[PDB]
């Protein structure tokens, strides 16, 4: 039999004129995730998931990260993080009642550490 | 939209658990109608949070 | 029909429907014409020229089957009993002289898990 | 305390017969199998005579069953023809003709008993109680069809959720707080109490009372400490200790900020400041008050929630997911031995107590080490009294090494004393007379290795066939035993891990080396054979110093094979490629996800052959008729026929062959597409299996049929496996490196010295954390002991003298804390001063020592 | 659950025992049982009595047989509206109240049982020395003569037939250890009093290894060799040899029933390639349990290309 041909090839392409910055901002944030997902438009997507089984009783990944930066970006105008957080119970993405208290409360410290030094030279 | 346990209230009384009123297919009914009425920035209404994305011509699913 | 009287649960209605679906056969096409594949056939004995068996090794050939453990004619045993056991011990000889020509038998020796050994039953 | 006779030993009341590693055990049953069914021994024999049918076996594994069955279906083969012929090659067969009166009655006796050999009683523990129980359904409980199931995890689980939503959701915050420190969720919760739930569920020392409520309990505490907090402030104000160099300045701080300490209620941790406020510290560091006394009451015994929460958890899970089972009519593996135990611990199955002595007047049991609690009550319970119907004990008793399964030596320690007769078997048949005298020279230092009366000493004699094995290496011969020393005063073994195990990967270079060029030989009286590269071995302990000797061994370029490959098949990069392929072949239409298997390294194209195909219209047509008739095949006949006409349509399994190493990728899409089958019989909704592949990729389970096959047999490299693993195999050279580190328990969890039940205190009393830490002082030099019945020619080990202190010069080590640093201190605490002498003093022509080589031969 | 397994019980009970019914019914108990019939019977008693008060019909299988029984033991020569003639082929087993009702049914209306057994010579147990003695008549060809068991005296009143169970030495120990069923069946069958039995045997000639043995097992002659004296088990070359390239009996091992499905397939083709003369209306292939093997199955016969595509 014979063997396989390396993948690396030389492609022919030629440069359009104008770019946008935040095409190129995707570019550099990873090159050859970059030129599989944008020059020849295949992506390696891992396909939607089931459904977790049951309500978050905690938080990790995006599913924090995304709160974490709403409550910075709150804090930062140092606005009332109450109405927030009422959003956020409304929304059903907290754990009931004093669990989701405590973390809110520790959530609160840790970005108000933070944005301290933030809004030190705003 | 975060729907994981079982229909109603009653359903969830019936096994003998608490009624935390929340995850099941009537209150995620419930948001997604409130979010096609309307939009979901204007806040909550009765501790529910609308639903931003069903506000087209596809709500027939619904 | 049997005149019952009272009143069922569901589940027995349930598992009742799914073993009645799960139980009818269909035995039309034995003699198509192409080669046929078949269990060993109770009460069955044709000739042919060549047979071939596979599944022989220890614990499966012949089927254990335990009685139900208060039966009656299990303690006295008389001539028109049928054995599960006997009657596959008979269909292997019967088997065994229907052939015409040549003949094939194969069992598994090794497990492919760990190269672990296995042995072939009693008849082979 | 005696040696046995296999023939001269009486089939009556009990008999316990240990054996130790090196034995022939399989050789030793099947004899006695053989007199039994004839009724040999005049004196010291059975009664009567017995068919096949009436001999009960029970063994652990089917594997073992198997082999055993086939073993005594060739003695009797063999045994029933030297009958006839009244003469045999075999000196035990010449000898058990002597007692034979009648040479035409065993000829009929053994042939009609081969004809009954298929439906031979031999069977494994599960399938004993399942089979009685079938037999015996009355008196019993059992239903007649059972939907067998084996994973007790998800529903565990799921069932531990509704107690975490029924039992912490309405406390107060005040409350709830301390619950939440401790931790977060029912999956953090049940990690730590898993073990404890399976199998027999133990007896828990200081039971909290049972009616106590949380709230209760809580505000219980509060006025605990609520009394001490309000009369403090009369405590302090007074100069009750005398200021000195010894008084320290921070305790006047302390007690200063013991007056802001008196503050609120709701603060539960308390100071270390009152830690020097009580009679036991004070005075040695007068009653000075009536409260003063008080507070070295509640800073003796500590406070919290956990014991309580853990009480209320244990018993009402278990309940739950019992009921769950019940009601929709499963029964487990592990569930119809406790069904068997309650009915025999009843009354009203005395009719079958006495049903199943009749019809199995006999009973031996395999290898005994896995003897549970709840086998050996049933045992006790059926054959230790009625007498006239014997029992018979075959057992290891040493090496013990499924604790983590469930096996448990406080069994079998309570089943030596009421047993009388005790028996043992010397002859080896396997190894050196040098590494006979080593094992045996190693265990006389201390009596009672094990810190245990109920295990004995080990005299074992070498045989005499075998008793000129040599293993000889350039020009002299070579010692038994080799151990390597380490210089220095106080190395870790991460060290060793780190630097010296490329020493090991040496010598064993140079072994190969010098085999394949003639120098080492491997001889059996004046025939030799050279050193192949493949039977030598090197043990570990856990598998995350394979990582650790692996690198060791493949900078000396030598190719190193894993035979501890746990790893389950679905972590690879093979199925998380086959389920874009297949779900591509459900989604024939979505040109997005469509070029996902097009450009996969399974598939095989490349950028230019993509590119073509992404603008050309008529190319990408053409492989969707393609797709639609797989489609119509999967949705028709099965898996199978839709695969392996896409593994030959494409002229793929040739293609990479071509490749770097393409038949080692190439097994997994076979080992796959087999599991489907067995997955898309049980499951019916043809959609489903994509979901079912998704479902286990994410969890791997280390269960049996996903993992791994092996490929080589023609050559193999060096072997690397596990000590659980590598039971009952013949190994001619092995190495065991990290032997001398250790790992020093904390869960307090400890079987009582005479009741040898399993007594839990959640609590962390030093007392009981001696008694946890001893058993696993003793498993350790069980497994050392297992890591030494290997090795027909040549063992060699390592040691390093490790301080567990981060300092060096100290004077002293903590290697006698481990298992061979104790048995070679003599039970004292030495130093390295102390154990240069002690490691020398008894070398004499089985040890061969040699200090740490930092450096590399080749 | 019990209701469905004592139904399964009382049905193979009416197929098997009608006098335990037949007591039954009555009320008194049968001597010699085990347990369970003190609840069993009135059970069934009880059954009876309430299939009689709702009014259903009485009539069942065991009374149903003994009064046809009785009624066509004494008849005319036939009675209108019944088969003048019929055959009756392929049968090994039957419950032997069926072969008391053809015992019946033979003095009005002809049958034929196309009988099968694997020997010529009887084969059977025996009950009495004076069994053996009635069983000493003929039995006739088709069309000429007339044949019987082997050296008429000396073998059947010798030690062949112990004193209580049937021959001790039978021979042939395949036989002696399958035939069970067999022997239990002729020797019902060759216990009747207007059976007229004549067979038509073709002799095999011994040329492969399975015509070598099916003509050991048919003429009921053993050729073991145990070695019992020194000469004799020193000598080999007193049994019949083989040719070393001959294939009418193999065996093959294999690790996965795949590999086995795929080894038989690879051997079938290659066999079917080199003998011309090979119809696939006649190699059949039998298997131990069809739901456990199918799929394998389905793969190869699936995925087999066009070229050479066997059907199935």
């Given amino acids: 039999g014979k063997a396989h041909s390396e993948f690396v090839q030389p492609l022919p392409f030629t440069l359009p004129e104008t770019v946008p910055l935040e095409t190129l901002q995707r570019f550099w944030a990873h090159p050859v995730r970059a030129f599989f997902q944008m020059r020849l438009q295949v992506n390696f997507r891992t396909e939607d998931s089931e459904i977790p089984d049951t309500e978050p009783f905690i938080l990790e990944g995006l599913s924090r990260y995304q709160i974490n930066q709403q409550l910075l970006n709150a804090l930062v105008e140092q606005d009332d993080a109450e109405r927030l957080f009422r959003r956020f119970r409304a929304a059903g993405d907290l754990p009931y009642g004093a669990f989701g208290e405590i973390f809110w409360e520790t959530q609160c410290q840790e970005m108000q550490q933070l944005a301290d030094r933030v809004i030190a030279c705003r | 939209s975060g729907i994981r346990w079982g229909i109603d209230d009653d359903n969830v009384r019936e096994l003998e658990l608490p009624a935390t009123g929340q995850h099941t297919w009537r209150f995620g009914l419930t948001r997604m109608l409130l979010g096609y009425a309307m939009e979901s920035a204007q806040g909550e209404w009765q501790s529910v949070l609308p639903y931003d994305e069903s506000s087209g011509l596809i709500a027939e699913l619904v | 029909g049997a005149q019952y009287g009272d009143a069922v649960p569901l589940s027995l209605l349930r598992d009742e429907l799914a073993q009645r679906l799960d139980q009818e056969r269909i035995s039309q096409r034995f003699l198509a014409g192409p080669v046929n594949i078949c269990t060993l056939m109770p009460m069955r004995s044709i000739p042919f020229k060549v047979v071939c068996l596979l599944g022989m090794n220890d614990g499966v050939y012949p089927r254990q089957l335990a009685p139900l453990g208060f039966d009656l004619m299990s303690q006295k045993p008389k001539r028109g009993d049928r054995s599960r056991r006997d009657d596959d011990r008979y269909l292997f000889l019967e088997a065994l002289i229907s052939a015409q020509q040549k003949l094939y038998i194969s069992y598994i020796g090794r497990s492919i898990q760990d190269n672990s050994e296995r042995f072939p039953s009693v008849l082979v | 305390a005696e040696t046995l006779d296999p023939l001269r030993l009486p089939l009556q009341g009990e008999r316990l017969i240990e054996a130790s590693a090196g034995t022939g055990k399989t050789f030793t049953i099947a004899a006695l199998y053989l007199r039994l069914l004839l009724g040999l021994g005049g004196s010291a024999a059975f009664p009567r005579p017995l068919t096949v049918e009436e001999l009960l076996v029970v063994t652990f594994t089917e594997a073992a069953t198997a082999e055993l069955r086939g073993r005594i279906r060739s003695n009797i083969h063999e045994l029933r023809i030297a009958c006839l012929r009244e003469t045999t090659d075999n000196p035990l067969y010449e000898r058990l003709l002597e007692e034979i009166d009648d040479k035409a009655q065993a000829a009929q006796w053994l042939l009609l008993a081969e004809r009954q050999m298929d439906e031979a009683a031999v069977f494994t523990i599960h399938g004993f109680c399942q089979r009685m129980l079938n037999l015996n359904a009355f008196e019993s409980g059992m239903l007649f069809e059972q939907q067998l199931i084996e994973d007790e995890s998800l529903l565990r689980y799921q069932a531990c959720a509704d107690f975490w939503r029924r039992h912490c959701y309405p406390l107060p915050r005040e409350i709830a707080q301390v619950v939440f420190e401790t931790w977060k969720g029912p999956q953090a919760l049940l990690r730590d109490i898993n073990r404890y739930l399976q199998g027999e569920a133990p007896v828990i020392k200081a039971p909290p009372p049972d009616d106590e409520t949380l709230a209760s309990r809580h505000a219980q505490i509060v006025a605990r400490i609520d009394t001490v907090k309000q009369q403090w402030r009369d405590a302090v104000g ?164 499924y604790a983590f399964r469930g096996a448990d030596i406080f069994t079998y320690m309570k089943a030596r004393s009421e047993v009388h007769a005790h028996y043992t078997l010397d002859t080896n048949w396997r190894s050196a007379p040098g590494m006979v005298n080593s094992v045996n020279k190693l ?60 020493v090991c990967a040496a010598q064993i270079r140079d072994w190969l080396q010098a085999g394949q060029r003639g120098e080492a030989l491997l001889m059996n009286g004046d025939d030799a054979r050279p050193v192949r590269a493949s039977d030598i071995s090197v043990l570990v302990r856990s598998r995350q110093e394979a990582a650790q000797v692996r690198d060791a061994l493949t900078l000396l370029e030598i190719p190193s094979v894993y035979l501890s490959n746990r790893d389950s098949v679905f972590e690879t990069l093979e199925a998380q490629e086959m389920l874009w392929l297949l779900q591509a072949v459900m989604t024939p239409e979505r040109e997005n996800t469509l070029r996902s298997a097009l450009a996969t390294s399974m598939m095989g194209l490349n950028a230019l052959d993509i590119e073509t195909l992404n603008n050309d219209e008529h190319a990408w047509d053409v492989v969707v008729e393609e797709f639609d008739g797989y489609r119509q095949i999967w949705r028709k006949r099965g898996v199978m026929p839709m695969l392996r006409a896409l593994m030959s349509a494409r002229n793929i399994a040739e293609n990479l062959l071509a490749t770097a190493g393409g038949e080692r990728r190439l097994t997994d899409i076979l080992h796959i597409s087999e599991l489907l089958q067995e997955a898309g019989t049980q499951l019916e909704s043809e959609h489903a299996l994509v979901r079912w592949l998704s479902q286990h990729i994410l969890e791997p389970d280390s269960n049996a049929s996903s993992q791994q096959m092996r490929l080589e047999s023609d050559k193999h490299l060096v072997q690397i496996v596990t000590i659980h693993k590598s039971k009952g195999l013949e190994y001619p050279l092995v190495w065991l490196p990290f032997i001398t580190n250790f790992r020093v328990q904390e869960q307090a969890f400890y079987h009582d010295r005479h009741s040898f039940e399993a007594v839990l205190d959640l609590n962390a009393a030093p007392e009981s954390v001696d008694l946890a830490e001893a058993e696993r002082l003793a498993e350790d030099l069980r497994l050392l002991y297992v890591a030494l019945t290997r090795s027909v020619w040549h063992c060699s080990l390592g040691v390093a003298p490790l301080v567990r202190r981060r300092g060096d010069k100290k004077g002293d080590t903590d290697v006698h804390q481990s298992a061979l640093g104790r048995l070679l201190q003599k039970g004292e605490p030495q130093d390295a001063a102390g154990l240069r002498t002690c490691i020398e003093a008894l070398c004499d022509d089985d040890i061969a020592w040699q200090t740490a080589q930092t450096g590399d031969n080749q | 659950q019990l209701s469905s397994k004592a139904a399964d019980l009382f049905d193979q009970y009416l197929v098997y025992r009608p006098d335990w019914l037949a007591q039954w019914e009555t009320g008194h108990l049968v001597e010699g049982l085990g347990e369970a019939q003190a609840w069993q019977a009135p059970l069934w008693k009880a059954l009876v009595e309430y299939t009689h008060q709702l009014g259903q019909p009485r009539w069942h299988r065991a ?17 209108p509206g019944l088969p003048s003639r019929v055959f009756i082929c392929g049968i090994s087993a039957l419950p032997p109240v069926y072969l008391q009702a053809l015992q019946a049914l033979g003095k009005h209306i002809e049958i034929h049982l196309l009988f099968t057994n694997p020997c010529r010579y009887y084969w059977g147990d025996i009950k009495d020395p004076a069994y053996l003695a009635k069983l000493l008549t003929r039995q006739r060809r088709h069309s000429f003569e007339d044949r019987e068991l082997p050296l008429f005296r000396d073998s059947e009143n010798a030690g062949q037939l112990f004193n209580s169970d049937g021959e001790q030495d039978v021979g042939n120990p395949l036989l002696a250890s399958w035939g069970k069923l067999g022997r239990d069946y002729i020797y019902l069958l060759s216990d009747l009093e207007s059976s007229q039995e004549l067979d038509a045997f073709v002799d095999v000639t011994p040329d492969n290894l399975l015509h070598n043995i099916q003509s050991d097992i048919l003429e009921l002659e053993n050729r073991a060799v145990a070695g019992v004296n020194i000469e004799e088990f020193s000598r080999s070359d007193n049994k019949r040899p083989l040719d070393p390239l001959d294939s009418s009996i193999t065996f093959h091992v294999c690790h996965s029933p795949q590999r086995e499905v795929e ?42 290309p066009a070229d050479r595509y066997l059907p199935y």
Wanted: aromatic share 8%; glycine share 4%; proline share 5%.
């Fill in chain 4, 443 to 502: 265990f006389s230092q201390t009596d009672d290795a094990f810190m245990f009366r109920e295990i004995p000493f080990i005299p074992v004699k070498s045989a005499g066939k075998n008793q000129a094995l040599r293993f000889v290496f350039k020009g002299e011969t070579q010692p038994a035993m080799k151990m390597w020393l380490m210089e220095g005063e106080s190395c870790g073994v991460g060290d060793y891990q780190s630097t010296m195990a490329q």
């Fill in chain 5, 63 to 79: 009374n149903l047989y003994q009064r046809f029984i009785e009624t066509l033991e004494s008849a005319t020569t036939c009675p």
């Fill in chain 4, 238 to 401: 007074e100069l009750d200790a005398l200021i000195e160099s010894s008084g320290i300045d921070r305790r006047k701080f302390n007690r200063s900020n013991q007056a802001k300490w008196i503050d609120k209620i709701s603060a539960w941790a308390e100071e270390e400041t009152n830690s020097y406020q009580l009679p036991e510290s004070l005075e040695k560091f007068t009653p000075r008050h009536p409260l003063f006394e008080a507070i070295d009451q509640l800073l003796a015994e500590p406070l919290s929630i956990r014991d309580l929460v853990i009480t209320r958890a244990l018993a009402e899970i278990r309940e739950t997911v019992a009921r769950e089972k019940r009601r929709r009519g499963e029964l487990g593996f592990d569930d119809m031995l406790s069904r068997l135990d309650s009915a025999l611990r009843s009354e009203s199955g005395e009719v079958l107590a006495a049903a199943i002595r009749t019809r199995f007047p006999v009973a031996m049991i395999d290898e005994f080490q896995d003897t549970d609690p709840q086998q050996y009550r049933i045992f006790r319970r059926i054959w230790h009294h009625q007498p006239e119907t014997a029992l018979l004990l075959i057992g290891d008793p040493k090496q013990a090494i």
């Fill in chain 5, 263 to 304: 080894v038989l397939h690879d051997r079938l083709l290659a066999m079917l390639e080199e003998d011309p003369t090979l119809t696939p209306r006649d190699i059949i292939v039998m298997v131990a349990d069809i739901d456990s093997y199918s799929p394998f199955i389905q793969a190869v016969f699936g995925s087999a």
